[PDB]
Amino acid sequence: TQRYYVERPIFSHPVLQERLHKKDKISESIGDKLKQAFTCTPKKIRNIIYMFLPITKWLPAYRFKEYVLGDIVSGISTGVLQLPQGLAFAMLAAVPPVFGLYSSFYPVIMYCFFGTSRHISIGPFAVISLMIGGVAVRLVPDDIVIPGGVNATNSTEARDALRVKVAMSVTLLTGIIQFCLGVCRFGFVAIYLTEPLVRGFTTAAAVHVFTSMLKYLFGVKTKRYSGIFSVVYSTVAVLQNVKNLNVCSLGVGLMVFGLLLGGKEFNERFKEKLPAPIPLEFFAVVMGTGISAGFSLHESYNVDVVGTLPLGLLPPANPDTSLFHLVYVDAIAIAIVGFSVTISMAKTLANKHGYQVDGNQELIALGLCNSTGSLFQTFAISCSLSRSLVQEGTGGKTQLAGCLASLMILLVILATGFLFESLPQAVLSAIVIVNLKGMFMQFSDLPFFWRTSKIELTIWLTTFVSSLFLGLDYGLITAVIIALMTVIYRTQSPSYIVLGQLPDTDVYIDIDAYEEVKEVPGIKIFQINAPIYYANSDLYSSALKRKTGVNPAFILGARRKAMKKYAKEKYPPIVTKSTLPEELQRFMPPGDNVHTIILDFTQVNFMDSVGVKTLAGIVKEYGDVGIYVYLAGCSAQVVSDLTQNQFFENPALLDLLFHSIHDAVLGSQVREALAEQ
Amino acid sequence: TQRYYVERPIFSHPVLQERLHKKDKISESIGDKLKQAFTCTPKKIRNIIYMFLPITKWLPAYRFKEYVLGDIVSGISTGVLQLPQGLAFAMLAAVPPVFGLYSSFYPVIMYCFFGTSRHISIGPFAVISLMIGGVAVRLVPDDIVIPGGVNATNSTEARDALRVKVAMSVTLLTGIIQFCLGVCRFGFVAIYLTEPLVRGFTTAAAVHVFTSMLKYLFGVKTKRYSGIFSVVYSTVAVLQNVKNLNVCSLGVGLMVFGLLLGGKEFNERFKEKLPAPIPLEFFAVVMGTGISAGFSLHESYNVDVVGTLPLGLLPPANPDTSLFHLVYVDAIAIAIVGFSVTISMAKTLANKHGYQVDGNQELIALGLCNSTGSLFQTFAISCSLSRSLVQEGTGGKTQLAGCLASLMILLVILATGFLFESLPQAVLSAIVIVNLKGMFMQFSDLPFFWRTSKIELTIWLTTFVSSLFLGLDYGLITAVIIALMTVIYRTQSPSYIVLGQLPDTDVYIDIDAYEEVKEVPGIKIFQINAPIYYANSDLYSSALKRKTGVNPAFILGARRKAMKKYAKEKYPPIVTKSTLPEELQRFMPPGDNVHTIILDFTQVNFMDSVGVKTLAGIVKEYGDVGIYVYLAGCSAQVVSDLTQNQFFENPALLDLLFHSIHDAVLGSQVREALAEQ
Numbered sequence A, B: 001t002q003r004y005y006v007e008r009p010i011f012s013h014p015v016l017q018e019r020l021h022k023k024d025k026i027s028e029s030i031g032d033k034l035k036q037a038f039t040c041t042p043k044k045i046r047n048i049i050y051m052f053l054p055i056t057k058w059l060p061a062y063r064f065k066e067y068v069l070g071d072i073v074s075g076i077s078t079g080v081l082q083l084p085q086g087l088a089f090a091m092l093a094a095v096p097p098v099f100g101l102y103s104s105f106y107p108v109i110m111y112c113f114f115g116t117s118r119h120i121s122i123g124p125f126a127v128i129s130l131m132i133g134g135v136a137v138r139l140v141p142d143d144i145v146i147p148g149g150v151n152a153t154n155s156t157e158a159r160d161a162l163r164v165k166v167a168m169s170v171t172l173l174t175g176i177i178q179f180c181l182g183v184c185r186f187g188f189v190a191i192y193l194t195e196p197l198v199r200g201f202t203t204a205a206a207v208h209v210f211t212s213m214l215k216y217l218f219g220v221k222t223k224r225y226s227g228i229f230s231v232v233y234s235t236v237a238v239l240q241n242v243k244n245l246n247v248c249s250l251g252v253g254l255m256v257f258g259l260l261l262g263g264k265e266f267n268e269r270f271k272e273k274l275p276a277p278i279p280l281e282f283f284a285v286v287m288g289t290g291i292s293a294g295f296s297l298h299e300s301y302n303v304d305v306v307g308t309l310p311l312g313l314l315p316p317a318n319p320d321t322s323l324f325h326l327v328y329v330d331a332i333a334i335a336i337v338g339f340s341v342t343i344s345m346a347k348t349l350a351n352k353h354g355y356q357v358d359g360n361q362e363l364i365a366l367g368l369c370n371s372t373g374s375l376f377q378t379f380a381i382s383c384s385l386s387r388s389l390v391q392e393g394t395g396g397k398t399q400l401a402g403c404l405a406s407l408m409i410l411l412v413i414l415a416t417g418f419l420f421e422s423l424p425q426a427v428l429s430a431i432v433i434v435n436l437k438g439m440f441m442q443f444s445d446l447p448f449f450w451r452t453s454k455i456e457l458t459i460w461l462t463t464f465v466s467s468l469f470l471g472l473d474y475g476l477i478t479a480v481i482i483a484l485m486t487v488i489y490r491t492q493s494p495s496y497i498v499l500g501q502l503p504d505t506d507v508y509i510d511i512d513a514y515e516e517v518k519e520v521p522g523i524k525i526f527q528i529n530a531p532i533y534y535a536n537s538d539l540y541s542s543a544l545k546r547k548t549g550v551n552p553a554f555i556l557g558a559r560r561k562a563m564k565k566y567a568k569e570k571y572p573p574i575v576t577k578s579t580l581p582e583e584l585q586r587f588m589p590p591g592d593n594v595h596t597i598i599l600d601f602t603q604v605n606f607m608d609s610v611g612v613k614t615l616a617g618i619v620k621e622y623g624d625v626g627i628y629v630y631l632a633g634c635s636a637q638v639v640s641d642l643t644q645n646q647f648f649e650n651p652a653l654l655d656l657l658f659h660s661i662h663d664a665v666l667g668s669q670v671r672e673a674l675a676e677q
């Protein structure tokens, strides 16, 4: 009453059409828009040199008073977590532990130059290292001994050198693939990664890492299973060898879990003014090695040790570009998996801080990091999750924290490093699992998605299962394709609702859920909140016939039955509706006198040939019975998809469309009134 | 002016909500609806016995006066086409030619009992026979000779017996798979077969059949290539052996092409009163064998001959159920391909004749036909296209035409059959290719789809290429998945249009295409005709910022720049909008004074967590700038997906939704007026 007064003529498709005229729509430089491109203006080249290389954006516009201290503390904490994590994922890749430090040094600084993100700790990610180890073991199995000229002892250095070479080759291929896709504007694919998809995939990866590193801390040595059901085989191999373990390895492993627990207690025990957000991992690892040395558990009970760490920067060496023909498949796998994880982490942290990250630029930077690392004896690299979260939470606000972490790792790899010699894998195990703590707390997504929407739970659980029992490349591909199939499903089980009319107004709402929307007499309105295409075409027609209670086949059957029982003694010059071929008797079953069916197309986004054909069949059938059909809510896309197909041959069909549900209702009533003459 | 007078109060989501109340919605027998099921009423059991076995629907309700003659003529024509086609596809499957007659006899009558369709000629389909031949050759290669005790000559009968056994095994597995899927209500999958998908897939199959049977009529013998790029290898093998051909084989092959051409001329030459729609194939094959015998081309130039046809019905024999472990993959392939083709043909012919066919019931019937045929030495069976089209066009109106064709084939296989002994493969080649004529004319879909819609052309061409260069199982799977990906694409490139307002009315149309829809001042309206979900979330936000000309990031940047240049001398107690933190100067760039952004959700079918998050970000950003955001066109699904996620924490957010674009516009104007106090 207060507002919303319109009082306009009924806009049938023809009426509204003549009350409009088309604009020129003349585009500028049709076909070849590139003439306005290829300009040498300083601004465009400046933007190009910014976007292909974003280091020139930070150093000029770099605040010093507050960014520096946060960068220092974040860099210290990140490097602290980088060291044992790098060593652990190095030995998880069946390579000498030093290459973990190599991986923690070179790609980090190169990404700091080329990466587009402010909270990411580039480094040796667990799953990428696990794939590297899988291929390295597969091509160089432990029972293949290449006889040299020495024959001194059963030296493993030849095997490890071959493993390093094959790792270098596969990582070069991953870098080349990532660079090619990045320059091919392939970073748009980073959008088919839903939040539950990434959550479940990374959680499954956490389970994989947990089981493998669990094999490590027990002191038991078993075969490195890989492929489908890899985690099952690995964990049953560990359980089959729960016996003959190393008791002191568990002693120190639970002891360093104990120092983490006493670290949470240490936050309440020893802190007055000095302790910063201390990287408890450094004190944990130092205490572990010191306590192990003092208690004499290695020399008395033979705990496994990280091993000799050859000091010195190794010179660059061109890798053998001849293993590609038998490593390319899982090189593709590693590239895709690493890019997906790092871009998801970057996007997730880009919402907390307001800025944005360029996906394909991230692809280019990560690929160049991997390639040049391959040149410098470095296995494959992406964004780890625990380290990146630690760097963000500590307070770093520029990639200089990563640069400082790389500086610390360089200091470890060049000057010092003798102290980390006598270090047990149990400490590394605890470091990794504690880093897995939050990633495992991430199962809280299941009840929340169960309450919120079960399709998101379906994507989450499917991603979890496919990335747990199958591999992780195959799990990722299956999870993405299921994600797209779930979107498809959501258009094949829509909300078929029959619309009533709110009294005295033009608002139309579901009839059988509000008890105040008594439907207009003589009219049935059917609405689908989904596009009408091939995969949802016959479902729509069947639902229309079933739900409205108006079945043309049943009506014709009843009509011929009643007629049988009664007798006991222009170029398309076709009217779309047929009259009633009845003598107006009462033998037929008295149902309703519905005379028009108003299909709602306000929610129908698009149509195709099959949908056009099925509406043609619907209109033809209801016209044969004697029931008009009006398509309400005509849009540009719907009428375009109806005109392109030979639907609007216009016997009268252009007069059926209406621009609103109320427009169709009023048109039907006006036509009925004009028929009562 | 004439109609459409409403004059209602502005229905914001809170206002509309209180003017409604929910109905009870109490469902009947929640959870366990099966208590009302499992009833023994005669009607339900009658419908069950009808639906699992539809032979009891025709014989009772069978008109005799007009159906009989059409059934006779259609059955004669169909059996005529069945004989040479069956023999040709038998020898195309690397089996003795009699099994073509076996395949044309048993499954036809069994489908006549169990099938649900009135225009289908069940029989030895070309592609299914080609897959059968591929597996039979693969498991029994031509260079594997099993030495018996005879050693008389290089007898091929042992090889052919092994080929028959392996064909029987794979066909039993296909029948079992089809029956299991049919009883598992898997016939719903028959809806992911778009018209262009089937058209292109069958056209590619026609190309495959053309090339293979082309190998046949040249009289040249080459290796039967199979796998990926199978057609390329086969045709280059034929071209490599164009030399050393059989000249008389081409003579008779082009001669019977000549008799087909003279048959089109014969329609105008010899027809006064007697000739029915004659099955020209019978006269063609009889004339071919008679002319070849009279002209003495075999005995003088050694043309290839069909071979001895052992007369007599062979007794049933249980097939070896031990090859399954190495035939199951392409048994699955054959089952899926055959079911897809036959269901597409049935659905296509079910629209020309008004009735309907049950997909999963077709699966059950076809599977039982294949299984029992496997019991009776019969290779795999589905619906051929040329024969089915011939049967429909001739005039048959019940599956009794197929039964009559089976009777004719039985007469050929039992009483007669000696006449078909001296028959050349060239006649069979011409029969098959002429049957391919229309299937090749089916390329007319390309320009038509180019004019109509290029997504349907994309599905057509992708299906063609994937089913031509790759295999046909792999081609079908790839084509279907691309079909679903095209549906996905259609929601990632929607029509982002800014809406103006038709003067004096409430109709909102695209602003920059009609020159009469001058937009309401101070308001920008943005509309997407697509759901807002993960795969189309950031595209929507970027398009909203870019297309409306309102960028919050640019506005904040300009605001801080102007401020810098100026200085030359409840539990969520947050207001969603922030006021203007400006001293009202002129240094900032004077653009537009847009104060609200009305997003259109009438076309948005659904949402998820990512879409809810991105609208939250949009609202928060524009509120920080000082611009209101109103979601127009609230629907049940959209508000449900907004309430389930923690979007409606209601600081004031429940007041932003509106039920129509005009409602949002009037609400914005009223609020602005109330602000000018």
Ligand SMILES: O=C(O)c1ccccc1O
Pocket (backbone or CB within 6 Å): A125, A126, A127, A202, A203, A205, A206, A209, A384, A385, A386, A387, A432, A435, A436, A439
């Ligand atoms: O860095 C890890 O150890 C890790 C591994 C898999 C998943 C998430 C992670 O943080």
Ligand SMILES: O=C(O)c1ccccc1O
Pocket (backbone or CB within 6 Å): B125, B126, B127, B202, B203, B205, B206, B209, B384, B385, B386, B387, B432, B435, B436, B439
């Ligand atoms: O019957 C055939 O030969 C045929 C083969 C492939 C595709 C369509 C067909 O009609």
